[PDB]
């Protein structure tokens, strides 16, 4: 036996190469480690979280340091709309002179990458101006990462290891994370915006050397304590304000103008300052809801176990049995992880959907490639987070759920009508797929036969009505905010719609992405998105709810979350575990996010080209997507290098192929299965044993990858190829035609 | 009211498409019908809106016709399957269609909505939950 892995004697005694592979695959599955107790589990998780925070801080510090060292931040400040931000320098000693010339650009005298993460715009908005400030921020983040690493080490020492009760105390953690982690952090960010960001945007330098004696507002803090809060909203930035200058600049620190700054085409800094102030107040209030040490406050266990509604006998909240759930969540780390992953996925989706339509950073809405990259990035991350939420829901079902302590509650009811849930999800998926695909191919056939007028073109009237209700007067509707006489627009009792003028100006501006005009193609692609969402949810939910067992495998819970199969008996049981359901659902998540990002990218490409009619007329049939989106926009990408030379897109050209390679490799791991490779490996073992001069000999017997390992490796190759190919295409097709 | 859709007979793009269309069976009368009855977008192609109280029959007739036909097929199949349950060899009745039974099922399913309502009211439409095979939880 080997020392490695330290956490599993079963793997340590494995005499094959599998021992290594599984050692990497189960290293962070702490609950299955040998002799693991709950307290040790929680303490190790605490230290690991400290390490992950340190890693995040080091990553941010590295981004800042490389921008300050090899970027062009100060040059980009003077002309954000025409200067390409620089990510970092290129040192690839096997470049040729054509590649060196092609990658020497953006005002640099050496090969550089063009930043597409938007960090230049973000740092510009928050008031950073010089490379020295970025360097100081990088040093500070290095020190912060060091502090968190030391904290992780310290909270593993015998005196500082928290007890299990400390980890299980939910109410104080909620109070501190609502009032302090969310509220106080938001208040401090609003303070940074008011004291630093806004003065810097008004041409006034505020730093550590002078922020103590430079008040952010002429009225001072006296106006706050005397109740004269309106003084903070007086004299806002004029519509002729020039960013990073005092020309047309007001003195207000907390306005509620709404809409966009006319020049930067982004949200007002004072608007975001007031936003974070209000958010901080709300979260600090929310952080006092639960009882910790002073009697006052709700008890979550009492709320979940309550059975009386002001005297009347109810079975629970909304007359639904919620009893016993407090112990279910409080004892299941996977349940909490499922909620956390689902919340983070929804938050990432909202981030993507709200930053492109309401850009928060100066001029970032005019950096088309950056916009596309950020949207695609956060949408794909959201999809992965949703997949993880449901995977850990299934893990909870198998490992942490017991029917006895959840007898008769709402979770048990869901487990009892899982069949109806899954069948109705399947019906929704079938209806959406059948009708969406049928209408798409009907339009395909009609357009192919020279009968484009015979297409079924269903108008998205409900979403158009919502847009009109939000103030979009293009459609001719006269409802709510698009009707100036409506009670919604006037707000008759109080007329406090100080947001409405700017909001309407932003909505009806034709040069932004705020409520883009939508037609039949948008209708069809949203229904395709709904189909993808419902099928991915069906796969994940069917896996989670059947994780404990089914008719084919009644005793699945006794086999764990991830096992290959139950053999060829009973008809065959390939891909029967809930892990296999998550594996299958990753494919559908990738497909759905591909549809979503294809739609976003093609619509915005049509808008940026000035050829919105192309999308409007071609998105209603799938040949339009295949020809006018993929084939039409692949030309510059695939001409990054050719027999006539190379340009700056060459890297993307290579990566575009690289992804297609990785994707292809995935098929090998996904189509061919283990026994073939095991027999081939046996033949190779014979060959090696019978060949002279080959003094090497395996210390771990070479074996084919396991079934589950093969599925995981194939999925990893598939996803990596997917991401690399689409990212290369996105960057090349947007940057190759624009800045 | 909706202003981004106009009648196809008043859309210059639709008129251009109509004029440039080939003169065959597939275009003349269909284009006249679209001009008289359809609403067109700025692209000149007919669009189907669901924001009009008027022409509500244009929405209800196709939906109702399809729902009737689909319910007819479903009720025929369901009644045939229920009639074959009492047989000795229902699987053979499923790979070998019983013509008298299928004809009777189709004739009854001609009036499928009333039969479905009667079955739902009498509790005969659905089987009890405890009498359906299920998997362990």
């Amino acid at each position: 036996a080997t020392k490695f892995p330290k956490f599993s004697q079963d793997l340590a005694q494995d005499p094959t190469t599998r021992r290594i592979w599984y050692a990497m695959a189960t290293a962070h599955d702490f609950e299955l480690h040998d002799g693991m107790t709950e307290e040790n589990l929680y303490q190790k998780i605490f230290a690991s979280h400290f390490g992950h925070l340190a890693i995040i801080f080091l990553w941010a510090s590295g981004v800042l340091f490389h921008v300050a060292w090899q970027g062009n931040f100060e040059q980009w400040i003077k002309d954000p709309l025409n200067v390409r931000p620089i990510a970092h320098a290129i040192w690839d000693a096997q470049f040729g002179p054509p590649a060196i010339e092609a990658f020497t650009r953006a005002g640099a005298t050496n090969p550089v990458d063009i930043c597409y993460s938007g960090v230049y715009h973000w740092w510009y908005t928050i008031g950073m101006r010089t490379n020295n400030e970025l360097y100081v921020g990088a040093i500070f983040l290095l020190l912060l990462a060091a502090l968190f690493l030391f904290a992780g080490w310290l909270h593993l020492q015998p005196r500082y290891r928290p007890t299990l009760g400390w980890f299980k105390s939910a109410e104080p953690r909620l109070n501190h994370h609502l009032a302090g982690l969310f509220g106080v952090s938001s208040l401090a960010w609003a303070a940074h915006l008011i004291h630093v960001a806004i003065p810097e945007s008004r041409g006034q330098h505020v730093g550590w050397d002078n922020f103590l004696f430079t008040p952010p507002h002429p009225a001072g803090l006296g106006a706050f304590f005397t109740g004269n809060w309106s003084a903070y909203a007086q004299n806002p930035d004029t519509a002729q304000h020039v960013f990073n200058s005092s020309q047309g600049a007001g003195t207000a620190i907390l306005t509620f103008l709404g809409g966009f700054h006319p020049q930067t085409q982004s949200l007002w800094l004072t608007d975001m300052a007031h936003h974070h102030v209000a958010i901080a107040v709300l979260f600090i209030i929310a952080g006092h809801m639960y009882r910790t040490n002073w009697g006052i406050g709700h008890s979550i266990k009492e709320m979940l176990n309550s059975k009386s509604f002001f005297g009347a006998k109810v079975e629970g909240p909304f007359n639904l049995p919620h009893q016993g759930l407090y112990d279910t969540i409080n004892n299941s780390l996977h349940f909490q992880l499922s909620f956390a992953l689902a919340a983070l996925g929804v938050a990432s989706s909202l981030t993507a959907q709200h930053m492109y339509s309401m850009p928060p950073y100066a001029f970032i809405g005019q950096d088309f490639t950056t916009q596309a990259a950020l949207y695609t990035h956060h949408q794909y991350i959201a999809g992965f987070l949703m997949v993880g939420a449901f995977s850990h829901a299934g893990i909870f079902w198998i490992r942490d759920y017991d029917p006895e302590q959840n007898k008769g509650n709402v979770l048990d009811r869901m487990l009892r009508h899982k069949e109806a849930i899954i069948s109705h999800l399947s019906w929704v998926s079938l209806f959406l797929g059948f009708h969406t695909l049928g209408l798409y191919v009907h339009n395909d056939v009609e357009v192919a036969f020279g009968a484009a007028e015979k297409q079924v073109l269903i108008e998205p009237v409900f979403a158009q009505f919502i847009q009109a209700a939000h103030g979009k007067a293009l459609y001719g509707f006269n409802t709510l905010l698009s009707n100036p006489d409506s009670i919604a627009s006037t707000a008759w009792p109080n007329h406090a719609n100080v947001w409405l003028p700017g909001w309407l100006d932003a909505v009806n501006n034709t040069t932004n992405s705020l409520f883009l005009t939508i037609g039949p193609g948008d209708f069809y692609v949203h229904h395709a998105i709904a189909l993808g969402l419902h099928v991915t949810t069906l796969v994940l939910v069917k896996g989670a709810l059947d994780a404990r067992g089914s008719k084919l495998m009644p005793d699945k819970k006794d086999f764990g979350y991830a096992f290959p199969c139950d053999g060829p008996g009973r008809g065959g049981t390939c891909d029967i575990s809930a892990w296999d359901a998550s594996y299958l659902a990753v494919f559908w998540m990738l497909n759905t996010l591909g549809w979503v990002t294809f739609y976003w990218h093609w619509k915005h490409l049509a808008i940026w080209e000035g050829n919105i009619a192309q999308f409007n007329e071609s998105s209603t049939y799938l040949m339009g997507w295949f020809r006018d989106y993929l084939w039409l926009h692949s030309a510059q990408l695939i001409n990054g290098y050719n027999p006539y030379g190379t340009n700056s897109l060459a890297i993307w050209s290579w990566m575009f192929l690289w992804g297609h390679l990785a994707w292809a490799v995935s098929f090998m791991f996904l189509i061919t299965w283990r026994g073939y490779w095991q027999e081939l490996i046996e033949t190779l073992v014979w060959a090696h044993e019978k060949t002279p001069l080959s003094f090497g000999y395996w210390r771990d017997k070479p074996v084919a990858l396991s079934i589950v390992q093969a599925r995981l490796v194939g999925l990893t190759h598939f996803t990596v190829g997917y991401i690399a190919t689409y990212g290369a295409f996105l960057i090349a097709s947007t940057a190759g035609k624009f800045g | 009211a909706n202003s981004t859709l106009v009648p196809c007979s008043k859309s210059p793009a639709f008129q251009a498409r109509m004029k440039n269309a080939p003169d065959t069976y597939y275009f003349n009368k269909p284009f006249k019908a679209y001009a008289k009855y359809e609403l067109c977008g700025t692209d000149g192609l007919p669009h189907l809106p669901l924001d009009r109280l008027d022409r509500a029959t244009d929405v209800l007739v196709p939906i109702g016709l399809f729902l009737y036909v689909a319910g007819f097929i479903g009720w025929s199949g369901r009644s045939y399957l229920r009639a074959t349950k009492s047989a000795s060899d229902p699987e053979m009745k499923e790979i070998f269609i019983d013509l008298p039974l299928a004809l009777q099922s189709i004739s009854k399913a001609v009036l499928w909505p009333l039969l479905a309502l009667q079955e739902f009211l009498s509790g005969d439409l659905t089987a009890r939950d405890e009498e359906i095979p299920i998997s362990p939880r």
Partner: peptide
């Protein structure tokens, strides 16, 4: 069973949907 609570919640949600549709259909403003 008439399902009192279920049908009351369902009717409230349906009334909300019908009100939104009436606004959407220009029946009320």
């Amino acid at each position: 069973a008439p399902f009192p609570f279920r049908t009351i919640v369902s009717l409230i949600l349906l009334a909300g949907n019908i009100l939104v549709a009436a606004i959407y259909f220009h029946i009320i403003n």
